[PDB]
Symmetry: T
Subunit: 164 residues, 12 copies
């Protein structure tokens, strides 16, 4: 196994299927923990993930969580699914919630998997920020567009983009 | 009439007069719907707008509103009044609330009407973002004037159509 | 004394020691008032500062506070401690809370004192924003640094430390 | 300027435009303060009026407000917009909220500007009360019409109050 | 069928049996909708009436309900049971809640069915108001008795409204 | 002693002294019970009166209190102190709270002691109503005046206005 | 009169008319008290029954009510209206609320008046339980098939089933 | 398409994957609506299902939902996943919540898909109830045992069983 | 010591004395943990048991407690005191709360100690269920009974009583 | 059988066994009533005791209970178990809850049964206060030990209170 | 006239009449301010006092009040009515609420008017504490007695005791 | 290092600087844990101390905390800052909260560091209690004095006083 991995889930419709990635990834990484964005809590009951993840970081239960330790405790940090909003915040250094604060601190171990409707993907400001992220050592995976649509990355494809 | 128009209202002091624009615009567009920023709810009772608008999009009443459909359902999207904050968020692609998420998705049908005190208008970062928006096909209206005042119906009508 | 000074405190761990700066600064400025970021309220009981400051601006107690008047009422506006988050928001003109709205309006009287862990300080996007702020007349102090032991790595690392009273007055008045 | 003026706003749909009257009236009266009926708070955020008015009397924030002092502090008291409900309460001396208690105490400085749908205006009991008010020195403006009644033109309220 | 009918129920002990009238009246009128007074909600669970009525107007669920439309949407408006309090409010044009505001607006289509203890019925002020209502085209049914007053027969309720 | 007496207190600044009338009245009547208007609560803590009166009738504690029984239970019903608002309500038959409903039903046993600022007392509408009350046999006491302002009645004067 | 009678009302639509039975039964039994199932409180304001009943047993107001005393205090215990749910719980000895605990304890004085839509009445499991109840000395009344259709036990009917 | 289908989901760990069945079933039935057990709400945010289902029946939002109409409005009623608890309640006619009340009323259109740990599956009382259900026309899918424990019925399995 | 033992306490009046059994049983079993029925919380403050028990399973504090693990973690599961309601639920496989779900899963390690007024004990449906439980390998102890005087009257009546600690030890270890 | 007895229970761990004393003492005193310290509610559900006691005084249910009458209805007032804290409060006349107010008032018929860990018992101030209590007519019982410290045997408490 | 005076009112039943002192005292002292003990709130609505006093100090409204400044702002601190509990707290230095913290700080300007039932007045501990207080420059009034029970001090007497 | 040390912090204005003492003391004692008085929670967010202390004893989070174990687990117990109120409570054996109960139990390991305004320090009752504490083996550090006001303990002096 490759070491501790942290999943930073955002308010993308596909966050409802995040449990599938967890059990799958639990086979390749020592640990697979998770952290959600405030808005993603409107899509699922995050406490359920405690049944699949090694650890769940909840900023509501604990408002004084140490983001620095969280970053040092992991070798890989994935933002999956990654919303246009969080992508753009990270690109501009905006860290107004735990997830986003963790992503600023650990930009060097960051892997972003964009997920959104195709029309949002065409936004000029989003794209400009994606270029900015790439030109600064932040790994941004290119969305799997199959309809013109846009699907969620294959569990194999995520492994390649991170380890390879 | 020209088709469905959506008003994205932000926390500007003039949002308290947004009802006047609605009834006026209802005469030129098939429909005139409205969507507010969370903060603008501290200035007015948004439910009242249900009495003038065809539809009110409330993200609190319905947290799973489809922003894509909202955008496809309109030919024009105005951010009136437009706060410095929202202008700057849109310019940077930040969409942390429904209104702002709708503006990212529909940048091609977007018309911005800035409203703020003159001193805020002079902010370097705001201005840099306004240039960015204009150089990217987002229509941004030049604030009237001593202080900035709301746009005249005559003007919004021209700007949104020309 | 030099005139009214406003402190804009953000959610930095050192906001718990902000009271020390207040009493100290009260000796050089006619008034020293304070305004906190929503998140900083998770670190301290902000009402206590009413005992040291001349005025406390609370956007929860009063959601319709006039930020323009707040800015005109002060000659100096310090963001101390200044979080990476607020620095980056100011740099991009994002003003989604009172503190941050006050900073947009008063960019000409703004003095920023960064405070964060050294690793956050190395963020490319933060640094790019800091340059942007400086190249636009916003005074951004260079975070003081000192040798400190880090139990994590079991090694001495250079850590970012909080401004010195002399160093804050000097940076502000000079 | 003519002296302190108090606006007593009621739950009429037009209370959403009361801010326009304030800024306008601020030019003719030393002060223009406001007081709302409990129900009118379902139409607007009354705190916003603090930005236009000199003073806002809020009975929820302060349940022990002195209505007598409020009345002595003003030379003119306008109920604008005036709902059928408040008009009828005043006519019968019913004062179950601050606004309505202020109107009982200051009947001598009272100016009423009715606003309601035309059908409500035709109510026999309302009309009987309006006559009662007029025959007792309470100034009641005649709803501008054109059939439907509309809000008081600002030069008209000014004329009705001063002249 | 004769058209849409609205029942305005008030805080009378017999409001607990209002469901019986609904199902019965549903056979003679296109629609039979209902609106309650705030106080009547202390006697029954008003949501249950949604199971018998075509529509339930709830001012708490929707504070901005259009009373004018409610009145235009009905040919008959019954206040059943009608409390002394509401009768007296209507007589004086007091409309401080939706039900009572609907009754002011639709005085021309109003039918009142008083229900209260016999001693309350003897109140001078109530009686004076009842006369006032009758002398102004408001139909006020004469309570059935036997000495104590009882509720309206379903046969008798129909006569009063339909002719 | 005389029969049971009920005090109906309204939102008059003097409802804060109401406890004084109770102990004194308590020496002449079998029972002296009390009932308040909802607005009275903003002046005093009505529960303390439980310590002086034989019975406190609270509509919030018990929303379905039987108002006919309360009237049948007393020989004298005193609305003391009486606000302009309750006086005008009773006069028009408005009975929208328990106190005002008890007064509609017991008009034949009702005694009113007005208390309010001298300026409120000059209102034409209230006066028309006071006349209406008296002309319908509801005893309304003539407010005491002392140089000109109205003052509360002495226990001796209420005793006299109620028994004789 | 025949002695104290307790009505155990359940979440049947007809519980909204339970007040009619009370006043009627008050003429044949020394006392007629009532106890509701938690769910029936979604159909009516149970406090109103205090105006017709001698006593109302409320397990929310008093969580430590003595069910044994309640049973000893009555000669007859009627479950009216009786829901399919409560019938089936009683048949299986399930007593997870006060009403149902009272019915287990007083099976010997129990009279059940079923009320439900005709389709629910045809349930195999319900019927099997009804047989079980009858073969164990629990009186179960046979509903009114009139409009198939279901109806409530006429006062005479309930009266005659209980005194018989 | 075969007509309206209702899914009654219970507090089984697999209820977190119920969304997958919905989208799949939406292709064979005119409508696919859903109703949850109170306890299942501790596993997921049920409001999200509004995005996949035609209708969501929520007894908290509406305590007076007509279970009879719900049953008449559907040709098929599946309890998927079906907990040991709900299976046993249905078998005994216990209907103390909306889902369970709907299952009593519509026993003739009921299809049960058991899901639980293998050890719970071996319970004597559960098994006795399963036999009872089967011998009374209630279709109870017979779960598959693999590796050793019960596995959740495949979408193909539910389709074949429901449409057989 | 014989291994981990779990006590499933129900809403019986005697649950107020459950602490006595705990300390006593702690001497014969490696661990003695406890789990309460929702209704039993109206009789006592369950948190107090944390002072005598090794572990307290609280489904309110943690709605996603693993009942399977709870069962595997114990060699003996006692329902003490056992109410008529829970006995009848277990007999019918009804598991609508944690305690009752634990009892379904661990029917093979289950020991029931009935406690209720004598009149409830005579219920036909309860008795039929007790037979069902016994004929299915669930150990159900025969309630103790002595002749106690009452004040509810002047008569002496037969009454069921709580099991002596020697009684539950013998019923559980044979 | 002797007069009415009142138990004043405090936040001692042993308050969880107070129900046992109740039924035992019930057979000797006309009435055995109870009152608890606020902190006591963290150990037991104080309402269950209504099932064993004649009366239960609860200051939250009724914040205006007459402690004078409470002391008069009883001939014996026991503070059992007696915590160090209440023992010290009583000794210094501190009465900030219903229980200690009752104790300040009924000091002449008060009997204290200390129950605490052996280490708290050796505290200088606690002992000093116990001396002051004994030197002022308050019966303070001598805790049973075995070196631990246990609760009052039923016979023991009767001896101390009656004899 | 005389300087600022402060009334520290405690939970004595006579606190319901403290309003009568205020008006009278306001004629001899520049300002007459007040602050109550938490328990006092159970007897009266302290908000009304704002209608009579110059300033009311509320520790619930503002938990960070400056007691030093308060003691510093007044020339006379009266605890009226003074309860047993407070008298003893002050004697032992206990200062667990605002009132009591103000009394410890301004013991040099303290005037105490005991009010309680005659039986409590006889408490040994209370009386010894009063001896202790009087020996430390704290003035404690000896309660008037009539009828036998203690009664509240009249103005002439609080005026005398305080101004001598 | 000298062993486990417990800090008992009270509602003194300087409790806002207690974090400084913690980090400093963490270098001389194996562990440095903390316990706050209910009132001190109005000055700071006590949860933050979890970031500097080894353990935080919170009586609200856990109402049944074992004070005896807390005392046995520490070699030194400091009340820093020590309010006049707590000092006086300890002196009289009053233990109405966890902190104060811990101080009664561990009087032999107790070290008190007074902090209050100079005027409060002059209170006769406080001083009498301080003498009482000293004459009973409770170490009471003499407040550092520097204009004339009292100031907080130099970490060097707290060490001397506690270690000698
Ligand atoms: C959306 C809406 C608009 C209304 N407009 C009017 C109006 O113009 N005039 C009026 O007299 N009443 C109007 N009503 C009815 C009043 O709000 C209602 O009678 C109320 O009880 C009056 O209370 P007030 O006298 O305290 O303001 C309206 C109600 C609603 C919900
Ligand atoms: C802002 C403020 C600061 C205070 N400072 C002190 C202080 O330095 N010393 C002190 O003994 N009391 C001080 N007090 C008073 C105490 O907080 C008060 O006596 C309290 O009841 C003590 O409670 P404790 O012993 O549980 O901490 C202060 C009060 C406030 C509101």
């Amino acid at each position: 196994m490759y070491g501790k991995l942290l999943i930073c889930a955002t308010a993308s419709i596909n966050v409802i299927n995040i449990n599938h990635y967890i059990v799958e990834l639990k086979q390749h990484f020592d640990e697979v923990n998770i952290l959600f964005s405030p808005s993603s809590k409107n899509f699922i009951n995050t406490d359920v993930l405690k049944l699949f993840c090694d650890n769940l970081y909840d900023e509501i239960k604990d408002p004084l969580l140490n983001h620095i330790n969280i970053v040092e405790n992991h070798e890989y940090i994935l933002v999956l699914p990654a919303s246009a909003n969080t992508i753009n915040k990270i690109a501009n250094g905006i860290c107004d919630n735990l997830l986003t604060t963790v992503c600023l601190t650990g930009y060097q171990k960051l892997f972003i998997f964009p997920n959104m409707n195709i029309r949002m993907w065409g936004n000029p400001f989003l794209q400009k920020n994606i270029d900015l992220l790439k030109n600064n050592d932040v790994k941004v995976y290119s969305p799997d567009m199959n309809k013109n649509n846009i699907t969620m990355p294959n569990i194999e494809n995520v492994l390649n983009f991170v380890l390879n």
